[PDB]
Structure 1
Amino acid sequence: NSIQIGGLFPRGADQEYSAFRVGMVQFSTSEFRLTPHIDNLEVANSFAVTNAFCSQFSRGVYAIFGFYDKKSVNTITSFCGTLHVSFITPSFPTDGTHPFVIQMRPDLKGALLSLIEYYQWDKFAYLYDSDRGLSTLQAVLDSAAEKKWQVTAINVGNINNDKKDETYRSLFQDLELKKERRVILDCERDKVNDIVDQVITIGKHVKGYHYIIANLGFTDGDLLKIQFGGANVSGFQIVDYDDSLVSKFIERWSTLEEKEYPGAHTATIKYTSALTYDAVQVMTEAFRCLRKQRIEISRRGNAGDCLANPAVPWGQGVEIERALKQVQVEGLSGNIKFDQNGKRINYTINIMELKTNGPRKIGYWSEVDKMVVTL
Structure 2
Amino acid sequence: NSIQIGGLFPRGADQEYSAFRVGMVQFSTSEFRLTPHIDNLEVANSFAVTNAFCSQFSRGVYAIFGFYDKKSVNTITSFCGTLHVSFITPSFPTDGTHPFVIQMRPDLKGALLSLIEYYQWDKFAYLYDSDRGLSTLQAVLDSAAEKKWQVTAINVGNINNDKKDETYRSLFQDLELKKERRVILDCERDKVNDIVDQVITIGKHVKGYHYIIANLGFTDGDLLKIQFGGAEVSGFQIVDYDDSLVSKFIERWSTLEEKEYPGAHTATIKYTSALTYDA
TM-score, normalising length: structure 1:
0.70
| Counterpart for residue 142 of structure 1 | 142
Q: Give distance in 1, aligned partners of 2:117 and 2:78.
A: 36
RMSD over aligned CA atoms reads: 2.1
The offset of 1:161, in angstroms, is 6.8
Q: Give distance in 1, aligned partners of 2:70 and 2:203.
A: 31
Q: Give distance in 1, aligned partners of 2:272 and 2:23.
A: 13
Q: Give distance in 1, aligned partners of 2:240 and 2:227.
A: 24
Check conservation: 1:15, 1:262, Cα contact below 8 A: yes
Check conservation: 1:155, 1:167, Cα contact below 8 A: no
Superposed, which structure 2 residues align to 1:289-328 within 5 Å?
A: none
More divergent stretch after superposition (156-165 vs 89-98): 156-165
Q: Deviations over 1:248-276 (max 9, x none)?
A: 11111111001210110111110110000
**Could you say if the C-alpha distance between residues 162 and 131 of structure 1 is closer, same or farther in structure 2, counting changes exceeding 3 Å?**
farther
Q: Deviations over 1:206-259 (max 9, x none)?
A: 332111000011111222153673321100110111111111111111110012
Q: Deviations over 1:166-210 (max 9, x none)?
A: 954762344322211111111112321211222344465733211
Check conservation: 1:123, 1:149, Cα contact below 8 A: yes
Q: Give distance in 1, aligned partners of 2:205 and 2:265.
A: 38
Structure of greater Rg:
1
Q: Secondary structure at the match of 1:21?
A: helix
Check conservation: 1:8, 1:38, Cα contact below 8 A: yes
**Could you say if the C-alpha distance between residues 274 and 205 of structure 1 is closer, same or farther in structure 2, counting changes exceeding 3 Å?**
closer
More divergent stretch after superposition (111-120 vs 152-161): 152-161
Bigger relative contact order, structure 1 or 2, given CA contacts below 8 A and separation 6+? Answer: 1
| Counterpart for residue 112 of structure 1 | 112
Q: Deviations over 1:147-168 (max 9, x none)?
A: 1211011111134379978954
The offset of 1:132, in angstroms, is 3.4
| Counterpart for residue 51 of structure 2 | 51
Q: Secondary structure at the match of 1:216?
A: coil
Q: Give distance in 1, aligned partners of 2:112 and 2:52.
A: 34
TM-score, normalising length: structure 2:
0.93
Check conservation: 1:87, 1:102, Cα contact below 8 A: yes
Q: Give distance in 2, aligned partners of 1:192 and 1:120.
A: 24
Check conservation: 2:205, 2:226, Cα contact below 8 A: no
Q: Give distance in 1, aligned partners of 2:138 and 2:163.
A: 21
**Could you say if the C-alpha distance between residues 189 and 45 of structure 1 is closer, same or farther in structure 2, counting changes exceeding 3 Å?**
same
Q: Give distance in 1, aligned partners of 2:272 and 2:97.
A: 22
Check conservation: 1:196, 1:228, Cα contact below 8 A: no
Higher strand content, 1 or 2: 1
Check conservation: 1:172, 1:203, Cα contact below 8 A: no
The offset of 1:23, in angstroms, is 0.4
- Identical positions, percent: 100
Check conservation: 1:67, 1:89, Cα contact below 8 A: yes
**Could you say if the C-alpha distance between residues 162 and 15 of structure 1 is closer, same or farther in structure 2, counting changes exceeding 3 Å?**
closer
Check conservation: 2:218, 2:236, Cα contact below 8 A: yes
**Could you say if the C-alpha distance between residues 231 and 250 of structure 1 is closer, same or farther in structure 2, counting changes exceeding 3 Å?**
same
Q: Deviations over 1:326-360 (max 9, x none)?
A: xxxxxxxxxxxxxxxxxxxxxxxxxxxxxxxxxxx
Q: Give distance in 2, aligned partners of 1:180 and 1:254.
A: 42
More divergent stretch after superposition (186-195 vs 39-48): 186-195
Check conservation: 2:7, 2:39, Cα contact below 8 A: yes
| Counterpart for residue 319 of structure 1 | none
- How many pairs does the alignment contain? 277
Runs (5+) with no aligned partner, structure 2:
none
Check conservation: 2:205, 2:229, Cα contact below 8 A: no
Q: Secondary structure at the match of 2:260?
A: coil
More divergent stretch after superposition (224-233 vs 40-49): 224-233
Q: Give distance in 1, aligned partners of 2:264 and 2:164.
A: 35
Q: Secondary structure at the match of 2:165?
A: helix
| Counterpart for residue 68 of structure 1 | 68
Q: Deviations over 1:106-164 (max 9, x none)?
A: 00111111111111111111110123321111111111110121101111113437997
